[PDB]
Write a protein that binds this ligand. Structure first.
Ligand SMILES: C/C=C(\C)CC/C=C(\C)CCC=C(C)C
Lengths: 145, 371, 266, 457
């Protein structure tokens, strides 16, 4: 039921996770990402974290295992918390509105260089209510969509 | 002749046993390469009447045929050559140092998601080759599945297989009871149903999924016919606490093979197209609309946040949770299953009265003794 | 000397002596052909093999124990061989698991490494007592984990229970103790009573099934041991299995002796 | 192979309490000697039939089976003893599978080797400072005090020299030679003397408890140790090319570990009576009656056992010959020439007088299967084994006019060439006379002799 699209979205997310084109995401790589998004846990934490997802995998996540995670295993509460968390991860300001610049802040963090207008467009494409801001309601509506 | 057998191979040790067929290791003298030989006693110690003696040969003569029709394929054994005598029928094939999947499933009670994926990835890709050549197996049990030192699946015992004429559907009941598709029994209990086609293998493969990931058959109970009504009606449950810790992508693909109606079953070609068996090919452009890019970055963020959240959730093992409910949480439940199969792993054998579900009690005694 | 020993152990029972030597020969070429049928069983008790033979030939073709022996001493030698292969390999022709625990605690079959696993657990304790018969860690320092004398001591502690099935229940309780000790960093520092662990597991089984709707008729005690017959027939694993109730009582018993516990590595 | 002995260390089991046990070294050396003393003229080249030492390969193969069950363990009470170096390679060569040889060797060097020699076995305590030099036995609780402080004998490093030079694996011969030359003590005018044992100093016992095989050891016991000295000198002689493997081992025991192919069993299916022959003929089998086998005479294995009681009988020495022991398949698979008459002895598993297992025809098929497979795996003679299998009325049906289905199937399998993991070349007993191990029983030629000459006349 995950569409060719959805599977593809999970795949590009897996790409954003691994800088090396390893075909795997290492404990170190995840880390580079979490710190990229600012919540930098211990190296041990990471080991456990990659372990919870894989259980064999020697500290490396795989796409079959990552889709396995990104498929909505999440409970409404569980996802809700998460959906919320990302949203915060999105707003360093924590103002509660998604800055066009902010999206840039996140990408810049994930090392993807994308056009400035395109970014505004990214929000604009998805933006009706928040002209220039994706409201959280927009975010949740969007994720399910 | 037997001289032709010993001019090329020399049997060293006994690998396995069967009802009338014995699997024996051999050395190929010209090549010094390890090979397995299955040694079927045609006369069967005198118990076989001339009909069964003839029928076993015709079954064996047919058996060479399918194994001749499929060759060079990575995940089915290669019948290197076959020798027939008046009292035996020798078949030499590849040596699998490790035993059947049943023996492996005994060692590891619950087989992990990553491991089963390539296991069946081969099996489904095995199933594609059989269906493209139009040959059904009707016998896809894990004891029919052999594994090598790299864990690669070698589907074995196409003893019950038969090539359907284009658009023809069989009626004979061939197969041990648990792994029989619903219309197998229905054709056994009715004449109107004109038969079952190549979709039979899909149900049997989907059964391995429930057995490998949970250590029990989807439908199992100690009397014979009761299992059958669970099959044709199709009452299966991803029961708790066992089946809740696996990802949701597992469940849907299990139901697809387990649908009772054959035409709606999930054929092998599209079976490999379900999200589980999708593979990460590094060199993909993967172009996306600006909404598509925004999801990816959001999903990339959502996945990191998720992983931290899921982990934070795991409850360390404490004294109390052991007292209240051991089976509820994964690390202790997998352990109880593991030491369940170390003590009574000899009780699990092939058949109905020796299946692995006999080692699991997932229902209250009262509901078990309700009728 | 062997013939005299067999005759003396017969104590005038000629039939058991001749069946004993015949079963010895059968066990012999089963060793020579299939050594794997005896990996779990370290002491070959030919007399108890005959007794279990009679019990299994009684459960099929339902008859009395005397009629069981009368039939037993009547079959052809090949029938002795295949029936013994059935009892040893575990092939099957009260209940299912009650016949799989009466056939597992009567031959004294234990999983590979059981005598090597009790050694590690006893180093975290002061002894292992079954029916008030302790097996202290002084034996562990005395005799190696792989020592045959250690297996003898463990089985002597494990053979203090006359009946077969509750002995295998004790074995399961010992092994869940092993796994919990692997999980638990701390040591109990005292004696653990495996028999009372199985008794508390039976009590928890009674409570859970009574809450879930089991009647007093189904929840019936074994006359001697006191463990419910359903628990004997209960499957080893599962949500309501024997090895979940024994994993439930191998923690509430450690509660009193170990006031504070730390479990790690999941 | 069936007798328990105090063994190489004169102490039986690990407990050292006078409890004799079946230690693998004794059985292996027994097999080595028995394989050595077969058909060996014992005055040498200037000898005759009266000096052939006759060894039944049945006991030899039982010994091999018991070592296979034992190895890498030396006894039930000991997980491994270094005395198995006297069995794996030299002198014994009692193990035919090289895999067991290396498995035992690495088990030994991992568990028993130190830096001053190899301990005899774990918890030995032969001369450790934690042992009273007066009490000859050991208390059970005393055994645990010997852990990690056992005495290391450099004697067995000379054994590692011997196996290394026999195998031809030079590294070993170098590493272990430098190991041994650093424990040799100089004596007299500077000659190397090998101490019997290196013992732990009483003050370093705790340190070796914490760190095994780390302390300096002192030479204790018999010096020089002429077992160790003799092995060291033999190794040093070879290692420098003054002795050859053939010189030390003319019998070529050094070829026990080389692969040996399985053999093609000859079987002469016989008929007790003409009507048994007709019933089998109706089933498409070609068998010859025990009366047509004449002049070749067929007898049961009990007669062979009685005959074999007349070897070495010397009345003045008051020796009565071999005790009455059962003959296995191998003894009954060879064609014996006694008083110029060829004699084929039926295997003992068809004897119905001794036990009733031969009264069951399915049991007959099963033990024929087991005997043929084991004899195929364990035939080490010149020629081809030949089993004479007579069909009796007990092997017919209850009606009496038909042979049993199981025996019919088995006989058809042997005729087709394969039955029970064995290659069977069936035929007449006369055809196999020139293609078998024809052992002449020289001891009978001028009780059982009267029976024999009654049959011959
Ligand atoms: C993590 C397990 C627990 C709370 C249950 C209590 C555990 C034990 C009581 C002792 C068993 C073995 C010990 C070896 C040292």
């Amino acid at each position: 039921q995950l569409t060719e699209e959805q599977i593809a979205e999970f795949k590009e997310a897996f790409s954003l996770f691994d800088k090396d084109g390893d075909g795997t995401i290492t404990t170190k790589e995840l880390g580079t990402v979490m710190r990229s998004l600012g919540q930098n846990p211990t190296e041990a934490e990471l080991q456990d974290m990659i372990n919870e997802v894989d259980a064999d995998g020697n500290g490396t996540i795989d796409f079959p295992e990552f889709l396995t995670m990104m498929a909505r295993k999440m409970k409404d509460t569980d996802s809700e918390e998460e959906i919320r968390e990302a949203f915060r991860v999105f707003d360093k300001d924590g103002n509660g509105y998604i800055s066009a610049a902010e999206l840039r802040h996140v990408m810049t963090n994930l090392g993807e260089k994308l056009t400035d207008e395109e970014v505004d467009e990214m929000i604009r494409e998805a933006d009706i209510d928040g002209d220039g801001q994706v409201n959280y309601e927009e975010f949740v509506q969007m994720m399910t969509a | 002749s037997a001289q032709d057998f010993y001019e090329n191979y020399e049997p060293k040790e006994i690998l396995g046993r069967g009802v009338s067929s014995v699997v024996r290791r051999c050395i190929h003298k010209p090549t010094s390469q390890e090979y397995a030989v299955k040694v079927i006693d045609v006369t069967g110690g005198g118990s076989f009447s001339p009909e069964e003696v003839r029928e076993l040969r015709e079954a064996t003569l047919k058996e060479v045929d399918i194994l001749r029709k499929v060759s060079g394929h990575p995940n089915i054994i290669q019948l290197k050559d076959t020798y027939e005598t008046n009292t035996f029928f020798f078949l030499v094939f590849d040596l699998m140092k490790r035993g059947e999947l049943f023996d492996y499933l005994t060692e590891k009670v619950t087989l992990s998601e990553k491991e089963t994926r390539k296991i069946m990835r081969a099996l489904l890709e095995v199933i594609c080759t059989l269906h493209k050549l139009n040959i059904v197996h009707r016998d896809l049990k894990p004891e029919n599945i052999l594994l090598d030192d790299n864990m690669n699946i070698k589907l074995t015992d196409f003893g019950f297989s038969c090539q359907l004429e284009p658009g023809e559907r069989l009626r004979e009941v061939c197969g041990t009871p648990s792994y029989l598709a619903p219309e197998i029994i229905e054709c056994s209990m009715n004449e109107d149903h004109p038969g079952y086609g190549k979709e039979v293998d899909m149900w049997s493969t989907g059964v391995i999924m429930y057995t490998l990931l949970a250590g029990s058959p989807p439908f199992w109970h100690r009397k014979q016919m009761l299992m059958l009504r669970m099959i044709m009606s199709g009452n299966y449950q991803f029961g708790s606490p066992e089946w809740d810790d696996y990802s949701d992508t597992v469940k849907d693909l299990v139901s697809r093979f387990l649908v009772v109606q054959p035409q709606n079953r999930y054929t092998a070609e599209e079976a490999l197209a379900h999200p589980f068996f999708q593979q990460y090919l590094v060199e993909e452009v993967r172009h996306f609309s600006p909404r598509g890019k925004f999801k990816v970055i959001a999903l990339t963020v959502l996945a990191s946040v998720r992983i931290y959240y899921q982990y934070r959730r795991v409850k360390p093992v404490t004294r109390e949770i052991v007292i209240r409910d051991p089976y509820a949480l994964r690390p202790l439940r997998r352990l109880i299953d593991a030491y369940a199969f170390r003590i009574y792993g000899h009780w699990v054998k092939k058949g109905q009265q020796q299946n692995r579900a006999a080692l699991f009690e997932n229902t209250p005694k009262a509901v078990l003794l309700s009728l | 000397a062997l013939t005299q020993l067999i005759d003396e152990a017969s104590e005038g029972d000629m039939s058991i002596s001749i069946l004993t030597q015949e079963i010895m020969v059968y066990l012999a070429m089963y060793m020579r052909t299939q050594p794997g049928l005896f990996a779990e069983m370290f002491r070959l008790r030919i007399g108890l093999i005959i007794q279990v033979m009679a019990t299994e030939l009684a459960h099929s073709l339902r008859c009395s124990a005397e009629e069981a022996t009368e039939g037993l001493m009547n079959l052809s030698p090949s029938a002795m061989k295949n029936l013994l292969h059935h009892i040893l390999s575990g092939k099957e022709f009260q209940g299912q698991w009650q016949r799989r625990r009466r056939l597992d605690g009567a031959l004294n079959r234990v999983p590979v490494g059981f005598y090597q696993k009790v050694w590690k657990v006893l180093q975290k304790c002061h002894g292992l007592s079954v029916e008030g018969f302790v097996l202290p860690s002084s034996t562990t320092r005395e005799m190696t984990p792989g020592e045959i004398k250690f297996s003898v001591h463990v089985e002597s502690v494990l053979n203090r229970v006359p009946q077969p099935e509750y002995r295998q229940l004790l074995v399961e309780a010992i092994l869940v103790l092993t796994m919990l000790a692997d999980i638990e960093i701390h040591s109990i520092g005292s004696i653990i009573a495996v028999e009372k662990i199985v008794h508390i597991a039976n009590d928890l089984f009674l409570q859970e099934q009574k809450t879930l709707g089991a009647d007093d008729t189904m929840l019936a005690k074994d006359p001697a041991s006191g463990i419910c017959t359903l628990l004997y027939d209960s499957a080893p694993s599962g949500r309501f299995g024997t090895m979940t109730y024994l994993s439930k009582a191998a923690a509430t018993y450690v509660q009193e002796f170990l006031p504070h516990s730390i479990c790690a590595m999941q | 192979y069936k007798t328990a002995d105090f063994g190489i260390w004169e102490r039986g089991d690990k407990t050292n309490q006078g409890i004799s046990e079946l230690n693998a070294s004794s059985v292996g050396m027994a097999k080595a000697a028995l394989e050595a003393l077969d058909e060996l003229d014992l005055f040498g080249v200037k000898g005759g039939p009266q000096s052939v030492i006759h060894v039944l390969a049945d006991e030899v193969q039982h010994c091999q089976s018991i070592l296979n069950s034992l190895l890498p363990r030396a006894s039930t009470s000991k997980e491994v003893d270094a005395s198995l170096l006297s069995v794996v390679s030299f002198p014994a060569f009692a193990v035919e599978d090289s895999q067991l040889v290396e498995l035992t060797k690495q088990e030994i060097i991992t568990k028993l080797q130190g830096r001053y020699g190899c301990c005899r076995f774990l918890r030995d305590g032969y001369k450790t400072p934690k042992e009273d030099p007066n009490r000859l036995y050991y208390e059970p609780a005393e055994l645990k005090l010997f852990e990690n402080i056992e005495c290391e004998w450099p004697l067995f490093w000379t054994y590692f020299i011997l196996d290394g030079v026999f195998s031809g694996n030079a590294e070993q011969v170098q590493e272990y030679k430098e190991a041994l030359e650093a424990v040799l003590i100089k004596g007299k005018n500077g000659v190397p003397l090998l101490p019997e044992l290196y013992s732990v100093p009483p003050d370093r016992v705790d340190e070796e408890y914490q760190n095994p095989h780390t302390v300096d050891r002192v030479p204790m016991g018999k010096l020089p140790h002429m077992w160790g000295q003799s092995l060291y000198i033999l190794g040093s002689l070879m290692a420098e090319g003054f002795l050859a493997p053939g010189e030390i081992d003319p019998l070529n025991r050094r070829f026990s570990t080389v692969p040996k192919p399985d053999v093609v069993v000859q079987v002469s299916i016989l008929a007790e009576t003409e009507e048994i022959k007709t019933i089998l003929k109706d089933k498409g089998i070609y068998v010859e009656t025990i009366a047509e086998v004449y002049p070749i005479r067929v007898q049961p294995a009990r007669i062979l056992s009685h005959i074999y009681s007349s070897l070495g009988c010397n009345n003045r020495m008051k020796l009565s010959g071999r005790p009455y022991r059962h003959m296995g398949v191998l003894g009954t698979s060879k064609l014996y020439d006694i008083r110029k008459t060829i004699f084929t002895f039926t295997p003992q598993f068809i004897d119905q007088q001794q036990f009733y297992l031969a009264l069951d025809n399915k049991m007959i098929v099963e033990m024929l299967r087991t005997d043929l497979s084991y004899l195929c795996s364990r035939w080490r003679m010149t020629g081809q084994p030949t089993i004479t299998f007579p069909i009796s009325h007990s092997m017919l049906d209850e009606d009496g006019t038909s042979l049993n289905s199981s025996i019919l199937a088995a006989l058809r399998k042997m005729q087709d060439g394969y039955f029970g993991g064995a290659r069977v070349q069936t035929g007449k007993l006369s055809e196999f006379l020139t293609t078998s191990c024809c052992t002449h029983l020289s001891f009978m030629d001028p009780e059982v002799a009267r029976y024999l000459d009654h049959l011959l006349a």
